[PDB]
Design a protein around this motif. Structure first.
Motif, mmCIF file in Angstrom:
data_model
loop_
_atom_site.group_PDB
_atom_site.id
_atom_site.type_symbol
_atom_site.label_atom_id
_atom_site.label_comp_id
_atom_site.label_asym_id
_atom_site.label_seq_id
_atom_site.Cartn_x
_atom_site.Cartn_y
_atom_site.Cartn_z
ATOM 1 N N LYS A 205 0.809 -1.214 0.000
ATOM 2 C CA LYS A 205 0.000 0.000 0.000
ATOM 3 C C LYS A 205 0.844 1.267 0.000
ATOM 4 C CE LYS A 205 -2.390 -3.061 -0.262
ATOM 5 N NZ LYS A 205 -2.925 -3.354 -1.621
ATOM 6 N N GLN B 94 21.718 9.762 9.843
ATOM 7 C CA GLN B 94 22.284 10.612 8.805
ATOM 8 C C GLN B 94 21.876 12.058 9.046
ATOM 9 O OE1 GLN B 94 20.209 8.458 5.941
ATOM 10 N NE2 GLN B 94 21.776 6.882 5.631
ATOM 11 N N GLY B 95 22.846 12.891 9.398
ATOM 12 C CA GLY B 95 22.584 14.301 9.568
ATOM 13 C C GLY B 95 22.347 14.991 8.242
ATOM 14 N N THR C 64 22.643 2.482 9.296
ATOM 15 C CA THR C 64 22.198 3.860 9.395
ATOM 16 C C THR C 64 20.798 4.013 8.813
ATOM 17 O OG1 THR C 64 22.538 6.065 8.484
ATOM 18 C CG2 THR C 64 23.516 4.214 7.304
#
Lengths: 50, 101, 51
Positions: free
Chosen positions: B28, B59-60, B39
């Motif tokens: 869906k 993850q910045g 990460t």
């Protein structure tokens, strides 16, 4: 990119000035899916030469 | 592969300890499942319960002028599995102590 | 796909000009999820002659 699908929705893709169309089923039909819609669009626009 | 389940969590562990790929999706929206691995995107995807000392990288966004960082888990019970808190931690498998001698 | 380059139209209304974003797969190669990061525009000289 195909995001979501909705009942009774016609999809138009214009490439190099030509348009191919696919119309999905209504609420009485099966639940439409982006995977099948994209597959149909790919196999119909693949007929375009070049 | 060692596969175990509890609540809504499916634990996976390779016997030889090697790496692998991991990705899941439904039919869906591909939102109800979260294949946590290595990460991920944002801390909002973290499940409530986990194992203590579990390490996940986030993850910045250099768009916000922030680099990457890591979060560690400690169970409220103090050991084992259960609810806990995620805190900014150091990356693992890296030398981090000073020779006091 | 990794190394894919897409341009984002900035808004001078917010006093930021345009920029670009590049892709790198998490698997390290081929197709797969990854990150979009602010990158340099392609097809432009970008190196200094060290000699």
């Amino acid at each position: 990119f195909i995001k979501s699908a909705d009942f009774s929705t016609t999809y138009r893709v214009k490439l190099n000035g030509t348009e191919k169309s696919v119309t999905t089923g209504n609420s009485s039909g099966s639940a439409p899916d982006t995977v099948t819609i994209a597959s149909d669009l790919a196999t119909q626009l693949n007929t375009i030469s070049g | 592969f060692t596969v175990t389940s509890t609540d809504y969590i499916i634990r996976i562990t390779k016997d030889d300890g090697g790496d692998y790929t991991l990705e899941s999706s439904d039919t869906k929206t591909a939102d109800a499942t979260s294949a946590i691995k290595g990460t991920v995107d944002s801390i909002t995807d973290l499940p409530t319960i986990a194992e203590h000392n579990f390490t996940v990288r986030i993850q910045g966004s250099a768009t916000t002028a922030f680099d990457d960082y890591f979060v560690k888990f400690e169970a409220t019970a103090g050991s084992g599995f259960g609810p806990g808190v995620w805190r900014e931690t150091v990356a693992p498998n890296i030398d981090h102590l000073l020779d006091k001698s």
